[PDB]
Amino acid sequence: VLSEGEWQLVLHVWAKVEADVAGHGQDIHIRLYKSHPETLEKHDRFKHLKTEAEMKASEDLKKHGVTVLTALGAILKKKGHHEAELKPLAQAHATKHKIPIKYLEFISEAIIHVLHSRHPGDFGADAQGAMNKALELFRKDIAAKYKELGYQG
Ligand code: HEM
């Protein structure tokens, strides 16, 4: 469980994300695919994007990153009370897309990296720790929902 202080730090940096959701989402996806190339194979519509500039230029990828961060931000704002928001997400990623928990660790690393790169004055040690705890809780709870659906990834 996170303390109220830790949730406030999470939501404080998230308000910064919200000034440019698209760009944060592009940088996160580009970092993810570059750091952990096995992840990009899950997206057939993104495979022809070979360079960073091609990735940034893709409206499809840009919209997808907003879809992703919108869902995540709605989850974070519930401060752990997120079952109703996690179920549809788990259902899609366990039954349709088949995304192992390890890939959710990889995108968590990419989120932390990009938040630090863009907002270092608002993402110091305690804020990084708070966001780490929140993403860990997200991953723990989505893993339990995965197993309820019969997926052990
Ligand atoms: C913070 C973590 C993540 C969040 C919040 C998130 C959210 C979403 C949302 C809201 C959708 C749209 C509804 C749907 O079609 O299911 C989606 C689609 C998708 N997700 Fe994720 N997701 C995350 C991580 C990942 C990761 C790590 C991968 C794979 C490496 C992945 C692969 C996909 C794929 C393949 C789709 C379908 C895209 C399409 O329709 O073309 N996601 N995600």
Structural features, described:
O2 binds at residue 64. The modification Phosphothreonine is found at residue 67. The modification Phosphoserine is found at residue 3. Its main location: cytoplasm. The protein is mainly α and 153 residues long. Helices cover 72% and strands 0% of the residues. The chain contains seven helices and no strands. Helix 2 crosses helix 4 (59-77) and helix 5 crosses helix 7. The radius of gyration is 15 Å and the shape is globular. Bound molecules: protoporphyrin IX containing FE (HEM). Protoporphyrin IX containing FE is lined by residues 39, 42-43, 45, 67-68, 71-72, 89, 92-93, 97, 99, 103-104, 107.
Concise overview:
The chain is mainly alpha-helical. It has helices spanning 4-17, 21-35, 52-57, 59-77, 83-96, 101-118, 125-148.
List keywords for this structure.
mainly alpha, Globin-like, 0% strand, globular, binds protoporphyrin IX containing FE
